[PDB]
């Protein structure tokens, strides 16, 4: 039936021209589609209506770098200067009335990664267990990771040079402005906390390693 | 000015039903259609259906017939979606969006309603104050063991907004843990009471924890 097809991922050197493909099921090669922009913890954004003649009708808030063209059953979204902010999932939508029933169908989305971007390395904020939590014979060590791009990180914890896997809970990155934030917690007994000379939060980001350590003394 | 305000985060027990609400503002409700979309797990959107507010005319995705029930009430300019017999698959962010009766464009979208389906014990956070570690000082707040999401964290109930960073929660055995930090001058704290405020609607609790010096 009505099916929109896109590649899942696409990557583009910052500043270069990006061309994204949303192919229409052959039976519906003449259909008018919409483009949508999906970025993190934000509602999806209307980008344009794109007809078969290549006529486009972009929504509020959309830069000129965004253009539209058609080549048969292929509908295209063209971004002239691929900027960091353009980094998003691009999804195409199409409506038709089969019988007297209105359907809308989305394609799988194209996650666009802008390449050649300069990185931001995490900065670390560590907290020892509160006196209050220690009274319950529990000890949560806190690692707050700020100001990183790209999103990808791995967190490890060390107890005096030796890794510790148990009681480690690590969050997913989330976006704050142009960069990302994350959190890791190490769950110990108050004895384990007092019986070691140091514990270390170790974040690994794009080849770089950042470490901040805590001592019970 | 055109705004679609959706209902709050809802915790639904498995095998029960939920009603989510989308209230329109700054436009004539009956002149446009309200459409409902589900956020897919990794990437993507899934169309649920549309309601013609004037006629009560509903169309649905084949997959949501017998699961979703779209209604709209002209008076309060509000659209409602009922999802029934919910499982963990129904745990997702659901959006309402506006479209013309003539085109496919969903031009204005709602903020989203996050639905959590679980039989997990509703648990109010345990909040610990985190004093500075060892002109300015970074204080912290630990929010340990809460279910479900969301919580709302402020400092001095929103009065202390400058230099706040509230980091993503972690999930482990149906209990969430979250931390926040704040950098203040030596002249603000400890001279002034600085509190981490944690409201958890599902437990009807609110805790204000004073950060106290060592």
């Amino acid at each position: 039936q009505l099916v929109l097809t896109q590649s899942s991922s696409a990557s583009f050197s910052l500043g270069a021209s990006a061309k994204l493909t949303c192919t229409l099921s052959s039976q519906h090669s003449t259909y008018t589609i919409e483009w949508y922009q999906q970025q993190p913890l934000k509602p999806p954004k209307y980008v344009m209506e794109l007809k078969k003649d290549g006529s486009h009708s972009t929504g509020d808030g959309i830069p000129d770098r965004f253009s539209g063209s058609s080549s048969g059953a292929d509908r295209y979204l063209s971004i002239s200067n691929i900027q960091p902010e353009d980094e998003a999932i691009y999804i195409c939508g199409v409506g038709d009335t089969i019988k007297e029933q209105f359907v809308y169908v989305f394609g799988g989305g194209t996650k666009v990664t802008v390449l050649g971007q300069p990185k931001s390395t995490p900065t670390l904020t560590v907290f020892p267990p509160s006196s209050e939590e220690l009274k319950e014979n529990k000890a949560t060590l806190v690692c707050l990771i700020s100001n990183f791009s790209p999103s990808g990180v791995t967190v490890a914890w060390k107890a005096n040079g030796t890794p510790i896997t148990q009681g480690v809970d690590t969050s997913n990155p989330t976006k704050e402005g142009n960069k990302f934030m994350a959190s890791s917690f190490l769950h110990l007994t108050s004895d384990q906390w007092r019986s070691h000379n140091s514990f270390t939060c170790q974040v690994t980001h794009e080849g770089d390693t950042v470490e901040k350590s805590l001592s019970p003394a | 000015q055109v705004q679609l305000q959706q209902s709050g985060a809802a915790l639904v027990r498995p095998g029960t039903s939920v009603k989510v609400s989308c209230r329109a503002s700054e436009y004539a409700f009956t002149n446009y259609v309200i459409e409902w979309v589900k956020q897919r797990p990794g990437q993507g959107l899934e169309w649920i259906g549309v309601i013609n507010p004037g006629s009560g005319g509903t169309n649905y995705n084949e997959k949501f017939k017998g699961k979703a029930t779209l209604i709209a009430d002209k008076s309060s300019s509000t659209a409602y979606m009922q999802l029934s017999s919910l499982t963990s698959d129904d745990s997702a962010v659901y959006f309402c969006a506006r479209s013309t009766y003539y085109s496919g464009a969903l031009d204005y979208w709602g903020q989203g309603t996050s639905v959590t389906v679980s039989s997990a014990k509703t648990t109010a956070p345990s909040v610990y104050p985190l004093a500075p570690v060892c002109s300015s000082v970074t204080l912290g707040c630990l929010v340990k063991g809460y279910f479900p999401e969301p919580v709302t964290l402020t400092w001095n109930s929103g009065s202390l907004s400058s230099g706040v960073h509230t980091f993503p929660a972690v999930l482990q055995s149906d209990l969430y843990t979250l931390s926040s930090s704040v950098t203040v001058t030596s002249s603000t704290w400890p001279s002034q009471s600085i509190t981490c405020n944690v409201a958890h609607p599902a437990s009807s609790t609110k805790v204000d924890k004073k950060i106290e010096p060592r």
Partner: peptide
Amino acid sequence: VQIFNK
């Protein structure tokens, strides 16, 4: 033809 009839 494409039809939008809601």
